[PDB]
Design a protein around this nucleic acid. Structure first.
Lengths: 146, 170, 61, 51, 183
RNA sequence: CUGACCGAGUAGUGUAGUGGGUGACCAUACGCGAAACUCAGGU
RNA sequence: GCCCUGAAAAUGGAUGGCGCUCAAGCGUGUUACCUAUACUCUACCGUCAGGGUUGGAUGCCCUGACGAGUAGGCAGG
RNA sequence: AAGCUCGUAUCAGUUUUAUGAGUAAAUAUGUAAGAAGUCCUUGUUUAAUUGAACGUGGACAUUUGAAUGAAGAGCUUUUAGUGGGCCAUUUUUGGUAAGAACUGGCGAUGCGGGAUGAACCGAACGUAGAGUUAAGGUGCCGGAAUACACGCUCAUCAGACACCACAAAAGGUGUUAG
RNA sequence: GGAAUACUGCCAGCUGGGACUGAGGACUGCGACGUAAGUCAAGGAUGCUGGCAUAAUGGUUAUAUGCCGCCCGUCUUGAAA
RNA sequence: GAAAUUGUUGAAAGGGAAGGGCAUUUGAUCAGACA
């Protein structure tokens, strides 16, 4: 006899659809970190890495400034799983460290000019294995036409 | 296997303004305690306003035969529900105990009247100590003094499937 | 259209449970405000000293 | 790897319950009772045999 | 209990045992052609498959549920020996999401010591002697997978009430005999 | 206009049988379960 | 309670046949016997789920449940 | 099918507690069993911040408001087939001998039994080894007792196991018991 | 008045015979017997022996027999028709 | 130098069908390894 479905698959992804070699290395590293650290930051980053391109909207550099203006967030490191796109609407960018998979040329130039330092996810994990002093920003999802 | 006799007493669980009812009792014939209690409840529900939910069995005890080894002429009064309307029936069974008499009565009712257990009601069973009051001939004939009869046409049983002697009877 | 005592008794029982919780907090004891279904009756002694148990003898026929 | 069954292979039974060893000493199943002369009451006996 | 019974008998009284607070229910019918109401009732009792049973607390709520599934299950009052044999032979304790046998007291302690139960004997005591944590112990125990009764069910037709010579219904004291054969 | 072991555990009804009966219908076991009605009181 | 009539057609016919009468027929009671792909114990393939693994990683090990199927969907070959 | 956000999760083809709905049951049908709740105090239409309303201070964290069970709950995109089905059960209607409302099956279903069967009784299916059963049977075909025990049958078309393809009243100086 | 037996249930009482399975693969853990050394029926078979070393076991197939099995596709609520 | 179809030689079966499935006997045939 049965009450639920005969066989039910897990409601979560296991590996990204993309075949990028570098992305899979980051996935492996973050899986290891989450399994051997149980840090919620590592689990969240691992889950975000499996999101599709549509489910990973870019985060404007102005949106990074938005979070940095929060009380006590001026020194917090900002981590964006998606891509950091430039934004000319902001004329001054606070000096901060930004970690993301990809940085646009304009955004990277603006960050360098503002005294910041673009960093990859692996380097961020090396600096913050447990995700201490880290801020996660997710780009708007309703913005994409749907 | 054989039928058992149990004395079943119901309490009709008391409540304020209704304390300690009269503790009605009955004599029930059944193979086990559960069937005896079920039959007691069935009779009690029909006799007066009582129910299993609003009642309990005070105590059940098996009524062992006082003299298990003694031939008795048991008088039987039974109400059996046929396909048509039910009617009274009086029978006499020469048996050794009440349990055996009731067991034989059940088979007799099932055979001679097709009356199943569900349709058989045991009104009363009483041992008949007297002899002149016996009314059924088939039991009366056995009361003759120095009664002796043969067993003509005795048939034996053979273990092997083949016999060479061509056996006979007696 | 429907407005009956169904909910009113619920609020009354809520108030009673709150009072019982206050009592059990003031005095150390199990709160015991959780309703329990009817439980089987416990054992007791029954005596026939008052009335002899009559036999019914289902005669009615 | 394999589930062993208590009530036999007494090693497993002793492993699950050390009291089993004490159980065997007196055997805890054939303890002698104490006889009493609590004769049944007259009313009960009369109601049992009689109707 | 027996001493009280003897005292009542010797003093013109009839002692009555307290209504049993624990019953054992075993599924008797298959899955096909089960009306939705009894099917759901059996599902709530974890009687997933035939020849399977679980311990049920005796309450007016559970009694009404048993009333509905009466034609499809056979139950009664188990004895201490039957409960002990069931726990020792078919004893499987529920862990996070898997059915793991209770092969050691450490396993029981690591998953039920929160309520003071740390050995198979303690679980048996809590089951037979219904305590405050009876529900926790009952849920922890996996439904028992019981074999068919060795020697047959003893009746020509199973699908009849025990009072009517069948298999289902109330077999309060005879449930132990059926369980022993099926265990 | 109220109480009742009062109608009555009656009518009626859910569940099960490879239960009976050609059919009409009926009985059993697990349950639920009334009203008119009856006595007294009320007005 | 059992039996006959009540229950009359057209090729020859079927409690299924053989066949049976203290039945191997009918009602009922008591026992042991045969088994389904059902149940209980175990071996293996696969699906699913929960854990372990930095010293072939989509990799390897442990545990638990399950395997019907037309139109049709997905996945792996 | 793809998944997304949360996660002990609120739930349940089920019961219990309370009561509407009914000369009037039973089965069902409706609402609740509270942390998103309760209480003391207090801020910003009535003669009066009197009160609604949303806030602050204070009192209770989980026997926290019944039982049982839960391979978690919600959410977004998109789409292959059907849109005429058949059988069976209950209620109602019609009726000398079918039309509406309910639930389970077949259709999509194997396996054992009814000598076979789509509507029946069991039971739902991975490949294997051992054992116990279900319905169905123990004279042979046919694996199992010409088993035990109590009563009935002489049938010149007896009888021989629900659905199965089915008759009674009545008559008999056949027979058994009341 | 003194006893057993019958029925029923328990025994973490003893024991004979028959059938299937030998799955895992250096230790790690839970237990028992022992003053100890150690042993054990304690998280899956070991010890000894005999025949053959080949068509002997075994696979394929021809055919002998126990039982079963209707003719494929489409359509039809339904076909072997 | 394929199948449908046909002849010669060797083997096997055949009482109003054949063909197929689980299971074994008989005939033929067949691979492998041995401090």
């Amino acid at each position: 006899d049965h009450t639920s479905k005969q066989h039910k698959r897990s409601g979560h992804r296991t590996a990204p659809k993309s075949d990028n070699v570098y992305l899979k290395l980051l996935v492996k590293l973050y899986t290891f970190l989450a399994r051997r650290t149980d840090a919620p930051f590592n689990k969240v980053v691992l889950k975000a890495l499996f999101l599709s391109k549509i489910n990973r909207p870019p985060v404007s550099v102005s949106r990074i400034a938005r979070a940095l203006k929060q009380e006590g967030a001026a020194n917090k490191t900002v981590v964006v799983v998606g891509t950091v796109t430039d934004d000319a609407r902001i004329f001054e960018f606070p000096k901060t460290t930004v970690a993301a998979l990809r940085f646009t040329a304009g955004a990277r130039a603006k960050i360098v000019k503002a005294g910041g330092e673009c960093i990859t996810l692996d380097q961020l994990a090396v600096r913050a294995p447990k995700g201490q002093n880290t801020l996660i920003l997710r780009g708007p999802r309703n913005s994409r036409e749907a | 296997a054989h039928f058992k006799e149990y004395q079943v007493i119901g309490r009709r669980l008391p409540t304020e303004s209704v304390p300690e009812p009269k503790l009605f009792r009955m004599r029930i014939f059944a193979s086990n305690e559960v069937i005896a209690k079920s039959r007691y409840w069935y009779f009690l529900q029909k006799l007066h306003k009582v129910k299993k939910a609003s009642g309990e069995i005070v105590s059940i005890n098996q009524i062992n035969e006082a003299h298990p080894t003694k031939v008795k002429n048991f008088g039987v009064w039974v109400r059996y529900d046929s396909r048509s309307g039910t009617h009274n029936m009086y029978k006499e069974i020469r048996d050794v105990s009440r349990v055996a008499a009731v067991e034989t009565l059940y088979q007799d009712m099932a055979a001679r009247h097709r009356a199943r257990f569900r349709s058989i009601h045991i009104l009363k069973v009483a041992e008949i100590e007297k002899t002149a009051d016996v009314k059924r001939q088939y039991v009366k004939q056995f009361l003759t003094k120095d009664l002796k009869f043969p067993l003509p046409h005795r048939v034996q049983k053979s273990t092997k499937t083949f016999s060479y002697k061509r056996p006979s009877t007696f | 259209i429907k407005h009956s005592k169904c909910r009113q008794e619920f609020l009354e029982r809520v108030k009673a449970n709150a009072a019982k919780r206050a009592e059990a907090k003031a005095q150390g004891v199990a709160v015991q405000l959780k309703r329990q279904p009817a439980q089987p009756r416990e054992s007791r002694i029954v005596s026939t000293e008052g009335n002899v148990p009559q036999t019914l003898a289902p005669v009615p026929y | 790897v394999l589930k062993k069954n208590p009530l036999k292979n007494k090693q497993v039974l002793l492993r699950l319950n050390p009291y089993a060893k004490v159980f065997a000493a007196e055997k805890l199943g054939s303890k002698k009772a104490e006889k009493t002369g609590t004769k049944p009451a007259a009313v009960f006996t009369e109601t049992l045999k009689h109707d | 209990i027996i001493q009280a019974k003897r005292d009542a008998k010797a003093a013109g009284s009839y002692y009555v045992e307290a209504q049993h607070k624990l019953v054992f229910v075993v599924r008797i019918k298959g899955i096909n052609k089960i009306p939705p109401k009894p099917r759901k009732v059996l599902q709530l009792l974890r009687l997933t498959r035939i020849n399977s049973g679980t311990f049920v607390k005796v309450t007016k709520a559970t009694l009404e549920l048993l009333k509905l599934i009466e034609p499809y299950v056979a139950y009664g009052y188990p004895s201490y020996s039957t409960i002990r044999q069931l726990v020792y032979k078919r004893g499987f304790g529920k862990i996070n999401k898997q059915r793991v046998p209770l092969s050691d007291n450490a396993i029981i302690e690591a998953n039920l010591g929160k309520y003071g139960i740390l050995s198979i004997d303690d679980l048996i005591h809590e089951i037979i002697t219904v305590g405050p944590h009876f529900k926790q112990a009952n849920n922890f125990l996996w439904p028992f997978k019981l074999s068919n009764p060795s020697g047959g069910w003893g009746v020509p037709r199973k699908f009849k009430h025990f009072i009517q010579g069948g298999s289902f219904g109330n077999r309060e004291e005879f449930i132990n005999k059926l369980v022993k054969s099926m265990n």
